[PDB]
Homo-oligomer: A and B are copies of this chain.
Amino acid sequence: SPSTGVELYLDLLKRTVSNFIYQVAHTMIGMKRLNNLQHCVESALRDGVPGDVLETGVWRGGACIFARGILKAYDVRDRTVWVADSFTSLATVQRNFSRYGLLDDQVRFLPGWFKDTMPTAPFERLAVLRMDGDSYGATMDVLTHAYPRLSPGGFAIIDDYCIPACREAVHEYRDRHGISDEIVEIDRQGVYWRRSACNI
């Protein structure tokens, strides 16, 4: 039960982004998934895991707004929320960020197909990489070109893992790269794993 300013801000932000207030919503992903996203960013911040937050696959922007908000709550000035998608138009998503006072230089957009946008994206490192989308191709493109920038201790979150195509992209990528970090359930559809450094 929230009591600090921070907790109250973040609790309200979850309620807001998911339109719990006015039963349109900026994300439909639900509390468990928003909570997980919070846990992952907070753990990265807390354990000093370096890097930005990258979200691929975007509805109206609620989960990314929430991520910028978390960083704002802890007054983090040196990390960026990358928002990657085809484009639910880009203008709409910017407007939405703007509505929460969270459209600023620490939010950057990557319009285009992921095979095009990912190899060159100016981020050097990621602390959290979150994929939303049930397509094998999108999932594999993001893994192939962005996961290698995910810091040890960082999180990879797969929103639509229960969908076989998505799952398969995830297993194939992991098996190809020898990755056996524990897959942890978030809810009926999503999972994540925390990246371990290579052995020594």
Are B5 and A101 in contact, CB atoms less than 8 angstroms apart?
no
Interface range on chain A (Cβ under 8 Å from partner) = 20 to 34
Nearest CB on B from A42, distance (A): 13
How many copies make up the complex?
Answer: 2
The stretch from A18-26, A51-59, A113-121, A150-158 touching chain B is A18-26
Residue of B5, B6, B19, B21 near A100 (CB, 8 A) is B21
Q: Give Cα A73–Cα B9 distance, bound, in whole angstroms.
A: 9
Q: What sequence of 0s and 1s flags, for each residue 1-43 of chain A, a beta carbon within 8 Å of any chain B beta carbon?
A: 0111111110111011001111110000000000000000000
Q: Which residue of B lies closest to A7 (CB)?
A: B5
Q: Give Cα A99–Cα B100 distance, bound, in whole angstroms.
A: 18
Q: Contacts of A3 on B, CB cut-off 8 Å? A: 72, 75
Are A72 and B8 in contact, CB atoms less than 8 angstroms apart?
yes
Given A16-B16, A22-B19, check contact A8 B73 (CB 8 Å): yes
Of the A-B pairs whose beta carbons lie under 8 Å apart in the complex, a sample of 13, sorted by A's number, is A3-B72, A4-B5, A5-B8, A8-B73, A9-B12, A12-B13, A12-B100, A12-B101, A15-B101, A16-B21, A21-B99, A22-B24, A22-B99
